């Protein structure tokens, strides 16, 4: 059924079921591992709005959860605290055990509102939402995560194979061609956002208007 | 497409066993300073094929999770191992 | 006693893999139209013995669940498999 990857002579192969190995003795299980991977490696437009475009909502489907043992650093983590504009929550709480993605570089924390037509928040292409050593089909309320995927692997019997910035936002529409965005520096000072703006550029703007108020 | 041949990761020290007494919780760290942070600069196209592999694997993975009632799966690799055993025995 | 030799069931498509892109959740069905609905008209006394078998199995099954603290068991068949392995190896 499911694929699985191997490491023979420090390089890669692939085999579902039928490809024998009279070589890989599979000495134990600690070499057998499962690995997450972020999509930043694929190099998508990792701005804020496309995220909203890369996602969606619906209902009738549950959440599901899975375990991996290791992943990748995050140049763009994401957390959300959103309510429907009536005042009710969009998202469900994060259950016990789950915690934010531990190892971030730019936490794109957000609040805002919008019609959350759907009691859960899936990825559009069917990606994951990568928490501490865990993935989901969906997002949980008020918790850091990252986008990524998973693979499963075998290893041979030789070896094994920090600031955490905060960033804030506001927005509306939120799953719409009318979706709005804003960037925080202060209580009051905000700005209309563009896809151009990087974390570094906005971090720089924590000096410009940080001086000019 | 784009692909980062380099890689930097955050494994756990499940073993390695470079351990004194800090294994105890009460005197141990909370949740951090615990994940080893290993780097990598090996074969470049290796990891590109790897990222590819994961992106492909996603499909059957979702079908699997869809195809149960479990919330928090933990039983995959054990199942794969025993499958391999049968496939050899 | 009474026994329905016919049978009609609701399996899942755990595999079968007649899959396009609907494997994704966001564009997939909710929880229905997902279970295959296979029919059966094979040997008649087969399924009667089968129903019998389940009714017998109930006993040890309850003893097992009684004999743990787990709520939501999922580990049976893996245990049976590995038992068979030992029984052969």
């Amino acid at each position, epitope marked *: 059924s499911i*694929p*699985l990857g191997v490491i023979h002579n420090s390089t890669l192969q*692939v*085999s*579902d079921v039928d490809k024998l190995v009279c070589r890989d003795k599979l000495s134990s299980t600690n070499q057998l591992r499962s690995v997450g991977l972020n999509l930043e490696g694929n190099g998508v437009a990792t701005d804020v709005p496309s995220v909203t475009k890369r996602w969606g909502f619906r209902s009738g489907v549950p959440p599901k959860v899975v375990n991996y043992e290791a992943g990748e650093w995050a140049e763009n983590c994401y957390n959300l605290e959103i309510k429907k504009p009536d005042g009710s929550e969009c998202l469900p709480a994060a259950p016990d055990g789950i915690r934010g993605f531990p190892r971030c570089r730019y936490v794109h924390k957000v609040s805002g509102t919008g019609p959350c037509a759907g009691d859960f928040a899936f990825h559009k292409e069917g990606a994951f939402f990568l928490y501490d050593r865990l993935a989901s089909t969906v997002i949980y309320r008020g918790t850091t995560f990252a986008e990524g995927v998973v693979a499963f692997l075998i290893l041979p019997q030789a070896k094994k194979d920090y600031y955490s910035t905060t960033i804030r936002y506001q927005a509306t529409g939120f799953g719409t061609n009318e979706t709005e965005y804003l960037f925080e520096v202060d209580n009051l000072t905000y700005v209309q956002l563009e896809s151009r703006f990087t974390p570094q550029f906005l971090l720089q703007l924590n000096e410009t208007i940080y001086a000019s108020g | *497409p784009k692909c980062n041949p380099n890689l930097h990761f955050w494994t756990t020290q499940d073993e390695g066993a470079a351990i004194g007494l800090a294994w105890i919780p009460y005197f141990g760290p909370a949740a951090e300073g615990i994940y080893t942070e290993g780097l990598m600069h090996n074969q470049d196209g290796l990891i590109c*094929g790897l990222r*590819q*592999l994961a*992106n*492909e*694997t996603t*499909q*059957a993975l979702q079908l699997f999770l869809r195809a149960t009632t479990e919330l928090r799966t933990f039983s995959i690799l054990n199942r794969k191992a025993i499958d391999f055993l049968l496939q050899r025995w | 006693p009474k026994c329905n030799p016919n049978l009609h069931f609701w399996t899942t498509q755990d595999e079968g*893999a*007649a*899959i*396009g*892109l*609907a494997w994704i959740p966001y*564009f997939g069905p909710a929880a229905e*139209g997902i279970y295959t609905e296979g029919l059966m008209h094979n040997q008649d006394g087969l399924i009667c013995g089968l129903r019998q078998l389940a009714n017998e199995t109930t006993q040890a099954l309850q003893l097992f669940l009684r004999a743990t603290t787990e709520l939501r068991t999922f580990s049976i068949l893996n245990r049976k498999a590995i038992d068979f392995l030992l029984q052969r190896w």
Partner: antibody
């Protein structure tokens, strides 16, 4: 650039067998997946089976499950297909076809091989 | 498990006209549909991905749309080259085809 090479045609008796080989060039043969579709004369199309971009995942139509065995070779920039136990219905033009998308998604096909009008008697 | 329905079966029409073709299914589908062309002997060609995303190197006359089960394909200002046979490839749950759609002149 994308240069499929559908092999020539051969007659095989009923119940026989065959190994097709479609070759390709013009891109990264590994980054994309392939498949097979058939068209009997005076007929429409019919998907046969498909493969991952690397060979892990296979997918077969129900009508030919087990009868046909797909395979490729990334190193040789080559596709294959092993088949057996063949009936008369299998008489058709089998095409090696490439996807639009990349990385073993997007079953919808970009290119089309030349086809080979396989026969049974 | 799913089945399509090309409609009309064909057409016998002339240049410059505009034509739409329909394509139905037994079950609801998103914008995960495609279109093709091929001629009596020719290897086929792709036209649209997702039911609206036109392909490269194709005239802009080619256009279609829909959602759920009903799906369209509208082309104005026809040509001789446009008079191939066309097809409608599901790829939601299984890469399904159907009866195809032929074109000709009076």
């Amino acid at each position: 650039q994308v240069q499929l090479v559908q092999s020539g045609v051969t007659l095989v008796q009923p119940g026989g067998s065959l190994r097709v080989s479609c070759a390709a060039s013009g891109f990264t043969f590994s980054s994309y997946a392939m498949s097979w579709v058939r068209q009997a004369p005076g007929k429409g199309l019919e998907w046969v089976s498909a493969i991952s971009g690397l060979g892990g995942s296979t997918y077969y139509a129900d009508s030919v499950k087990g009868r046909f065995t797909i395979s490729r070779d990334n190193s040789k920039n080559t596709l294959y297909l092993q088949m057996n136990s063949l009936r008369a219905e299998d008489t058709a033009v089998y095409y090696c076809a490439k996807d639009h998308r990349v990385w073993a998604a997007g079953y919808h096909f970009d290119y089309w091989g030349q086809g080979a009008l396989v026969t049974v008697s | 498990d799913i089945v399509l329905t090309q409609s009309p079966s064909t057409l016998s029409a002339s240049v410059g006209d505009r034509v739409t073709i329909t394509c139905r299914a037994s079950q609801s589908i998103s914008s995960w549909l495609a279109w093709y062309q091929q001629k009596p002997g020719e290897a086929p060609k792709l036209l649209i991905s997702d039911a609206s995303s036109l392909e490269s190197g194709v005239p802009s006359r080619f256009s279609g749309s829909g959602s759920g089960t009903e799906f369209t394909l509208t082309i104005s200002s026809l040509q001789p080259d446009d008079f191939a046979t066309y097809y409608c490839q599901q790829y939601y749950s299984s890469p399904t085809f159907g009866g195809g759609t032929k074109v000709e002149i009076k």
